[PDB]
Amino acid sequence: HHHHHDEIISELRELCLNYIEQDERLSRQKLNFLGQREPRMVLIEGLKLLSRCIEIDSADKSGCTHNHDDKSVETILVESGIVCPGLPLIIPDGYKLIDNSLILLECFVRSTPASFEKKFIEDTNKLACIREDLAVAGVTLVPIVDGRCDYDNSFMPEWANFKFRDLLFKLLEYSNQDEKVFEESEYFRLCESLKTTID
Amino acid sequence: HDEIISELRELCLNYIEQDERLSRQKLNFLGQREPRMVLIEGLKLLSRCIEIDSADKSGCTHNHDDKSVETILVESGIVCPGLPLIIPDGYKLIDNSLILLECFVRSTPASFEKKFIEDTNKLACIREDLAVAGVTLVPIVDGRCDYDNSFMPEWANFKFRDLLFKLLEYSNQDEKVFEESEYFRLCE
Ligand SMILES: [Mg+2]
Ligand SMILES: [Mg+2]
């Protein structure tokens, strides 16, 4: 056809344009993904695009607002006239305030039972350790941890999701040769000689 | 053809500032393959830039979702049914006054004045039914003479329009030199 890497990139863009549902909360990340032309960058922003699908998909199913702009909890409450300072820097995947209860959502994907459970406890405990600062605000914390075992989500048909991840794999397991060829360049050796001059 | 669609793609991606209000329209534009659709979305995209500048100059919110006056009010708690389907380029409900913004581009004084009166009458004919509901209409018509907007350098703005223009003149294909020579010759 062929499939030399620039055509992989091309097929990823067609998948993004033809088979990722046109939800406004993906517009920004779709645009950042379509804007890339270097292979490791296309790979990075493709992975970030697929993660936004899962996070937003999670926020919808959990009945709160996807944290579109990665606000902190302190920011979410400071945005609603509720002064709570002295709280960890926590950025939830979703949130929703009612009337004095604050739903906070963390979601994730793990592929083995051991890592699933371990991750579930970690995010449970991350949310639990601010329950009391919120109590003196005084707002009730409603922690939600949404663990998933795969990458299915409602903005991608399953076949396109799989083909997208499959092209991403070919893109990584290829640009894992361009950086290896890079380590024999000279510009690599000239980088190597660049640090010794500053460090 | 394709190199025109390709360099248009790169202007959109690299030389239109990444204000998120443009994101959706940029993406509809980037998804078009055929000249006709590239042209309409191209023009819509230039218009969105201009509407968004107007909203920002006029102190009101850009009508991103193409909401209706009907909708804008019910979202602020004003039940006022029976209004014609009017969809502004901008809006801002403020106390009990509804700022409605109509934004446009024209390039001759004659067609500028015409389109100005039209958008004036467009909003004015819902003034009374807003007064029934309490809200006083604040109608703003902002007409422009060109496509200058704050999201593109001027050279890019010109190159985009020059590229869209060549799609427009391409849509020709002689064609009319064979009209009756088979077409107007069917129900004959
Ligand atoms: Mg309009
Ligand atoms: Mg208008």
Count residue pairs from A and B with Cβ separation < 8 A.
23
CB spacing of B23 vs A27 below 8 angstroms: yes
Q: Is A17–B26 a contact, with Cβ atoms under 8 angstroms apart?
A: no
Contact A28, B23 (CB under 8 A): yes
Distance CA A72, CA A75 (A): 5
Pairing of strands B61-62, B90-94: antiparallel
User: Checking DSSP bridges between strand B97-105 and strand B136-144, what pairing results, if any?
Assistant: parallel
Q: How far is the CA of B35 from the centre of ligand 2 (A)?
A: 24
| Contact present, A110 and A147 (Cβ < 8 Å) | yes
Contact between A68 and A92 (Cβ < 8 Å): no
Name chain B contacts of A27, Cβ cutoff 8 Å.
Answer: 20, 23-24, 27
Buried b (16+ CB within 10 A) or exposed e, B114-135: ebbeebeebbeebeebbeeeeb
How many CA within 13 A on the CB side of residue A112?
3
Structure solved via: X-ray
Known catalytic residue: B92?
Answer: no
B101 is written with which tokens?
A: 């913004």
Contact B137, B126 (CB under 8 A): yes
Sign, Cα dihedral of B174, B176, B177, B183? positive
Question: Among A31, A32, A37, which would you mutate to test the B interface (most chain B Cβ atoms within 10 Å of its Cβ)?
Answer: A31
The rounded distance, in Å, linking the Cα atoms of A84 and A134 is 7
Residues of A in contact with B18 (CB under 8 A): 31
Looking up tokens 């004919």 gives: B125
3-state secondary structure B120-131: HHHHHCCHHHHH
Give the ligand with the smallest distance to the CA of B105. Answer: 2
Structural domains in chain B plus CATH codes: 1-60+153-188 (no CATH), 61-145 (3.30.70.2640)
Q: Between the CA of residue A25 and those of A14, A20, A148, B5, what are the distances in Å?
A: 19, 12, 21, 26
Q: Is A146 in a helix, a strand, or coil?
A: strand
Are B23 and A35 in contact (CB < 8 Å)? no
Q: Is A135:A101 a contact under the CB 8 Å cutoff?
A: no
Are residues B99 and B140 in contact, defined by beta-carbon separation less than 8 angstroms?
Answer: yes
